[PDB]
Amino acid sequence: GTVWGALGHGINLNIPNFQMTDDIDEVRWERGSTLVAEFKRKPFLKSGAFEILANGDLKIKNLTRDDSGTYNVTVYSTNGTRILDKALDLRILE
Amino acid sequence: GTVWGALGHGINLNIPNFQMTDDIDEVRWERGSTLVAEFKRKPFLKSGAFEILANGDLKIKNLTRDDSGTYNVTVYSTNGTRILDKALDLRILE
């Protein structure tokens, strides 16, 4: 579809034939290679072997030798400021 | 510094000296170049000239010539299933 805007004015690009519900995890808007806006309710998780807790802690379900190594955590405040950055060396008893 | 895990057991990597408050936008866990987990409350927005509405529509606040072109929208359901993928051709009258 084609949408018309005009200089100096604002505009809302409406998602064609769609209704927002709770069964929606993400809405992504891109313009070519540019990511313009993105909404994502559930956290990103590499796999089910992991889960991020309420407090922000990382839970690893079943440890294997592959899980050892250095993990980096970064925390950003509501305004985007990087308030924390720590490296956590996870070693595994075998 | 280092946390110890045991083969076959699970573990919570605790963020060093930190308590979760409402002033936290993002918590990111990485392992090398791998993104392990990520939580982000606020949407991603290229700039203040944009905002994503509740329904998922894209609001471009002030239209300029450089805002015209094709915008691709992609919506995913809760289980990551791509439920929609449209493209709007935004043309701007000068």
B37, A31: Cβ pair inside 8 Å? no
Size of interface A-B (CB pairs under 8 A): 283
Q: Which member of A12, A29, A86 has the closest CB to residue B73?
A: A29
Resolution of the entry in angstroms: 2.1
Question: Which residues are registered as beta bridge partners of A13?
Answer: B58
Q: Give CA separation, B89 vs A49, A89, B68, in Å.
A: 41, 49, 8
**Mutation site, B2, B3, B11, interface A, largest A CB count within 10 A:** B11
CA B57/CA A27 separation, integer angstroms: 9
The CATH fold assigned to A1-94 is: Immunoglobulin-like (2.60.40)
Phi, psi of B4 (to 5 degrees): -105, 135
The residue to which tokens 């930190």 are assigned: B18
Q: How was this structure determined?
A: X-ray
Sign of CA dihedral A74, A79, A77, B50: negative
Contact yes or no for B24 and A59 at CB 8 A:
no
Residue ranges per domain, chain A?
1-94
Nearest to B76 by CA among A87, A78, A18: A18
Partner-chain contact A27 B73, CB within 8 Å: yes
Please give the structure tokens belonging to residue A61.
């379900």
